[PDB]
Symmetry: C3
């Protein structure tokens, strides 16, 4: 096999040029398809052209930043020095302008919108004040992250809610997800037959969770998920001044669950501080995963609001975490170590899909069993309370009634009107004691009732509430924060960092409370920008 040896030697000699040429040919073929499509018809091929353009722009941008990082940093340095020199007096001017802007916005927009929006702003202040009073180290508070996190939420809300471009963008983004979740019906129909709709939740909704988990694993293998995570984490790190580890985890928890987001930084967990560990747990409790997003949309919950809430939950989580548990130690991990995220042990795309599918088995099983147990307990509790309430000739006592009268102040501070605050309080109670699947199920019921158009009151009982209240409830309920999740979060994090078991347990409860506050903070910002129809 002398010829074979010569071929092997030739391949070894010019390995780099051979593969580079092959990739170049593939790129040229793709560009040829794009240009030909535009030539035949442009209006029909516009989205393909747009996707190609943005991809080219980002690839060129990333290459330039990597290659010319030193030159750009040196070029920026003189301006930074000048700003540092004049900052001692310029800080008052900047702060005064920002305060004036906030005042003007309240006077000319919030007051015009109505009283409820002002109450939302007041609740935002009150929640922040309460977090300060009950802080771990009230004296040792670094206020830069708190203000920046709130400001970033306010800017995101303005761009996505009060501007036609952002409103259109997220409405389009939500509609694509709604289209994407319909593909799972093909697999559900075969496995469970054409009668799979006889059992809606089990045979139609859970397959959506399976399909999304598969896609998320495929994206992780390709590396797009990390690409977005790094881009977002840099913004939060630069503006807020947080540690790289917590910034990366917060950015990654937008798309990933509480139990799989810390895996983005596994080696460095033993060396993190208590504050960073608290922030990690807080971020997990203040967000949802991309696998369960489709199920909530299938119920009837707005896709745009869910996406907006998930994005806004990261800066709030870090801001509340820093205020609730500030940093009193020296961080050890650096930016390069945090940003590098180890992809899984998948040789090819299809193997990644199988791994994602297999992981979804325990996910759906636990979801189904937990729902069965919780609803069974709820029915038992309601029957028992009715039995106890009949002694005083009040047989209507129920878990809902107690929660409505208990969690009412929390909803009123978020800007919900007096009548609907009692209805939102029930959803808050469902989320706090059970999981958020129950709360969104009840919320979907109310949304459907309103869309039907039936009477708003029957026998003196309110049947549905306003559209604005539904939006606020959507933001407040977007989280994995429940008393039950405390144990599994602790167990998983100890399994990843056995040496830090003592520290993990200490901050878990504070993190669980911080996550709920962060969700409420997002709801307050949504409430003060939405209008009363």
């Amino acid at each position: 096999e002398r010829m074979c040896g010569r071929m092997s030697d030739f391949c070894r000699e010019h390995k780099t040029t051979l593969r580079y040429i092959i990739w170049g040919i593939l790129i040229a073929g793709y560009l040829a398809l794009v240009i030909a499509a535009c030539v035949m018809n442009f209006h029909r091929a516009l989205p393909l052209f747009v996707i190609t353009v943005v991809a080219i722009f980002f690839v060129v941008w990333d290459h330039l930043m990597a290659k010319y990082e030193s030159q750009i940093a040196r070029f920026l340095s003189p301006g930074q020095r000048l700003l540092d020199s004049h900052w001692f007096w310029l800080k008052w001017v900047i702060w005064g302008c920002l305060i004036l802007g906030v005042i003007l916005w309240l006077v000319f927009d919030t007051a015009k919108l109505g009283q409820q929006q002002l109450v939302s702003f007041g609740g935002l202040i009150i929640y922040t004040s309460l977090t300060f009073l009950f802080s771990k180290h009230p004296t040792k508070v670094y206020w830069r992250p708190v203000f920046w996190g709130i400001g970033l939420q306010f800017l995101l809300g303005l761009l996505i809610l009060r501007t036609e471009p952002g409103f259109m963008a997220f409405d389009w983004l939500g509609k694509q997800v709604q289209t994407f979740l319909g593909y799972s019906d093909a697999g559900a129909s075969f496995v469970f037959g054409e009668k799979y709709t006889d059992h809606f939740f089990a045979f139609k909704v859970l397959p959506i969770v399976i399909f999304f988990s598969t896609v998320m694993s495929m994206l992780y293998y390709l590396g797009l998920m990390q690409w977005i995570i790094r881009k977002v984490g840099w913004v939060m790190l630069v503006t807020m001044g947080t540690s790289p580890v917590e910034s990366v985890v917060a950015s990654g928890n937008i798309f990933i669950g509480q139990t799989e987001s810390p895996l983005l930084v596994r080696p460095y967990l033993p060396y993190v501080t208590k504050s960073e560990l608290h922030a990690i747990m807080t971020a997990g409790f203040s967000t949802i995963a991309g696998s369960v997003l489709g199920a909530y949309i299938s119920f009837g919950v707005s896709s745009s609001h869910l996406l907006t809430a998930s994005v806004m939950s990261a800066p709030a989580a870090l801001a509340i975490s820093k205020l609730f548990w500030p940093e009193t130690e020296t961080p050890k991990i650096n930016l390069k170590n945090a940003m590098k995220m180890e992809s899984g042990d998948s040789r090819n795309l299809l193997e990644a899909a199988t791994q994602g599918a297999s992981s979804s088995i325990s996910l759906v099983a636990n979801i189904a069993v937990n729902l069965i147990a919780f609803l069974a307990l709820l029915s038992f509790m309601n029957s028992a309370l009715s039995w106890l309430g009949n002694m005083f000739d009040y047989p209507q006592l129920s878990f809902e009634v107690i929660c409505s009268y208990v969690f009412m102040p929390f909803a009123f501070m978020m800007g919900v009107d007096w009548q609907d605050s009692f209805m939102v309080a029930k959803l808050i109670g469902y989320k706090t004691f059970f999981n958020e699947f129950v709360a969104y199920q009840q919320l979907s019921k109310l949304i459907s009732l309103r869309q039907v158009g039936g009477p708003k009151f029957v026998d003196g009982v309110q049947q549905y509430m306003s559209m604005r209240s539904e939006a606020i409830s959507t933001y407040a309920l977007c989280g994995f924060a429940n008393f039950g999740s405390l144990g599994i979060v602790i167990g998983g994090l100890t399994s990843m960092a056995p040496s830090r078991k003592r520290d993990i347990t200490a901050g878990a409860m504070r993190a669980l409370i911080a996550g709920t506050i962060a969700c409420f903070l997002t709801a307050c910002i949504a409430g003060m920008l939405t209008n009363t129809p």
Copy 2:
């Protein structure tokens, strides 16, 4: 935060009084609700008053025993010394009176009831004699536990079967369980839709198992389960004279499965003797769990008889275990170590519920798969036997026919009449080779046939049997003793005590046989007290 530090110092200074006062206020509030309910109406609030009274009585009782244990023991000592002094002659009088009482009961009650009850008593003697002949150490038999265990069963049967108070109490207790298992329909309806009744067993019965497992975990967290276990174990220990470890496990196996009852004593397993290890396995094989109780009731099996059999199975298990495998060593574990039972790692009630729910996944999955395999094998075996039986012009040969002609003597000794003994033998065969889900399914069929009222014989084949025979079959089938369970029992116990693998394997088969004998012993006692309608 000087004020915060002062508040923290104040809380630390009087931590004990602060929490005690809070608990006192809660207790006062509960009492205020109870008294107010009684004032408004007494007949309507009676059960709440009763529950409060018994709870107060037990709390006071437990506190007094804990505080005044030494004084009470010293007060009792003189009487014990006097009894010991006169016991050498007083033992004959007591034994003679007990023998005379047994004779009188047989003559004036059993003979009046009929021949079958006398046969039940004879079978009770015969089973005990057979256990003695095939004992491990026939010479080294301690007869106190054997007689006390049988006597306790006889007293329990008299109080629960032949007295209006006990009969009413357990009928009421069974009805509450029947009400309790209906709450799972709320969760089943949502997960599996309103058509969940199209698939009865999978979508309605298994959720009952999930719900009960959840409740059992919640009770274990609160500590009620241990409270009852200690109370029962003390009675068996004091009367029978068994070791604390086996007494606790036997009392706990009334409510818990064979594989989770030994966890009540995990640390001390390596130090137990062979006899105690045999008793532990025997108790597991002679009882059922509280999670599968609802499924059996859903089939149609009597709730009262199931509860009565579960209670009566513990003294029988210990009695047969001691006789079959008596003690020839010195026990090491003491009472205080055995009674202390380590609760699970659950921070709150809701976390306990989630843990109980998660554990039920493997339970229902194994149940469903095992049933599919066993019934498929049963159909294959019956077809093969019919194929083989046709050679001799007898195509009716089947697994049922062989079992009916094989296990008939065991049922006749339990007091079943000649005609129905062949029908009970089939159920015994189903339980021995398959699990007890199959046997109870067949028993429910027969119960439904009788309740319908159709012909008792069609084409010369008996369709159903008497009510008394159904009760006896209910007692005999209440156990986890099957050839398949031998492996999983050994594996789980080795996993808990790796060093004792050699001892565990040796006694597993004897324990499996002892459990079946104990179940038969309970059935014999039930048969000799029930009447022929």
Copy 3:
């Protein structure tokens, strides 16, 4: 208990004779039943007589070989020496006769059958040549296994396809399996109700997998599976000259999956060579398991062809493995060590059934989830391609179209006609990127369409293809070779042999390719013997 001690002493003294006599009595009873059945009627009892006769023959044969092995080997030795002496010249005569026979068969049978059969023979040559060119060590090729493996396939095909006895035998064997898979309906009906047919695949097909897995475990406990494996492995070892380890694994992969066949040789995995490890993986990828056989038959795929393909896949796997990755080291494991296969830790038959049932849980769960994900991805890909294809006014672009135009040459070489080659290529694509459940589902659709008798072309689109093409597709698709299975195969084999992780990864890709080639080789042989109707 002096009598008991005497009985124990008597049992110990003559333990061997006591159990031997008991077994003899049981054998005599069985023979009495057989003879009596024949006496009453012979034609009705014929199959029982046949089974008894063959069992007796094999038992006697095995005993004689074990006892008289040395004498037989010595008796054969002189002939072997004489053949070795004259082999230097006799080899040319034997080889020439074999070549002449092949030529005569082609001229007088293949040419008569038609052109397509000749193309199948050409494809067989071409696939072998390609494996030679891309071999790991082309110079160090041992050609004995390659020719013997192909020859054994040719002989098996002749006996099973072109002879009435073999054709009848495998048709009968397939029909028995079809009867055997109907027994699972008994368990499915109870667990999932009488409406279990509303969801065909989940509630009827998967239980078949559960039932077969249970039966396979029971057979493994009894030892029949090993008995057949040794008999087949000896034939392949003697004729082909392969190592005992790979021969045993190849014979065992006919009945067992890729992940459980290596367990037949667990201790010796660290000591195998690279070539043997490659052969093990190749055999796993070139065969299916007996648990999934029923599901494929339920779809509508021929049982006889599936059995024939599974048998023919072992010699092909070894032949291709040796050619693709020949041996350049010295094997260490011997025949006695390889043949001894350690049965599982099952005390009795029923425990084995439970263990087999439990293992099937993960099997069916992974199957269902993988199918849901793959079909969902397929729908998404097709929609995306249609969206991209509309730019060029070609909205019919799809995964099927691309695969049809890509994998066409592979199907044409196997002997499929021009029109049907494009249809077979789609099935090949489904098997390569997804699993073989999808491909067989599509194949069953085509088979049903043909059996209906509808038009073969509608709107110029072929709806179904010939019966011969369906057979060829059946042979080509019989394998577990897919890109996704690569990871799980590597993980399982590393878990069994941790030290060989580096070697396992290197040969996995070559093994995956070899398995597909082996499946194609079987299809080519089937194509050249089947006739065009």
